[PDB]
Structure formats: C-alpha cells, structure tokens
Amino acid sequence: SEQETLVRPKPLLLKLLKSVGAQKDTYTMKEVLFYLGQYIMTKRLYHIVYCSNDLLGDLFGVPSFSVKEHRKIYTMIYRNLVVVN
Ligand SMILES: CC[C@@H](C(=O)OC(C)(C)C)N1C(=O)[C@@H](CC(=O)O)C[C@H](c2cccc(Cl)c2)[C@H]1c1ccc(Cl)cc1
C-alpha cells in the first residue's frame, strides 16, 4: 500500500537518488527506499546511521537515526518529496 505510492522527489532528494544511478523524475516509494539503502551502504554511513556532514543529513534534518525506526524514517523522507496526483 505505502510502498506502491508514486512520488516526485524535491531537488535535494533527486540529487541523492541520481548519485546512485537513479535517472527518473518520478518513483514508487519502494524504489526510493531502496536507493537510500544503497546510498547508506556505499558512503558507509552505517542499526545506527550517521548522517552529519553528509547530504543525507541535509535531507533528514538530524545527525543520526536508526534503520529500525521506519515510521520516523518515512516522515523524514516525506518532507523531501510530493506525491504524484
Ligand atoms: C539501511 C539498509 C536498508 C535496506 O533494506 O537496503 C537494501 C538491503 C534493500 C539495499 N534497510 C534495511 O536494511 C532494513 C532495516 C531494518 O532491519 O529494519 C529495512 C529498512 C526499511 C524498510 C522499509 C521502510 C523503511 Cl522506512 C526502512 C531499509 C532502509 C531503507 C531506507 C532508509 Cl533511509 C533506511 C533503511
């Protein structure tokens, strides 16, 4: 239900997705969640992910978070996109 949703990332998020191969302007949340997982392991920011002094921090507005807290994560991802009507 929620992962199927189609979204349109804001610039700061598009930049992040593109740095890992993304190349579209619209995405299902499943894809977004996945590309973020990719970014996290490639830049080696990580259950605790440290995002200060990194683009992901500008995206989430926090210096760190736990990968177990999905609802919180979703909320931080959501501020950086708009849903596709
Ligand atoms: C950090 C690794 C990444 C992943 O699966 O990445 C691969 C293995 C798919 C690449 N990942 C996990 O490893 C899981 C963490 C956990 O054991 O709870 C799931 C997690 C997640 C799933 C669905 C929604 C949300 Cl908000 C979070 C998901 C994740 C997705 C996005 C973000 Cl920012 C942080 C974590």
C-alpha span between 65 and 57 (Å, rounded): 10
CA-only gyration radius of the chain, Å: 12
C-alpha span between 13 and 1 (Å, rounded): 22
Q: Which helix (H) or strand (E) holds 83?
A: strand 81-83
Provide the resolution (angstroms). Answer: 1.8
What technique determined this structure? X-ray
**CATH number of the domain bearing residue 33:** 1.10.245.10
Q: Coil, strand, or helix at residue 72?
A: helix
Q: Count of domains in the chain?
A: 1
Q: Which domain holds residue 12?
A: 1-85
Give the residue, out of 4, 44, 70, with the most ligand 1 atoms within 8 A of its beta carbon, to mutate for a pocket test: 70
Ligand 1 mean position to 72 CA, how many Å? 12
C-alpha span between 22 and 49 (Å, rounded): 21
Sign of CA dihedral 57, 59, 61, 64: negative
Question: For ligand 1, atom 27, which residue shows the shortest CA distance?
Answer: 70
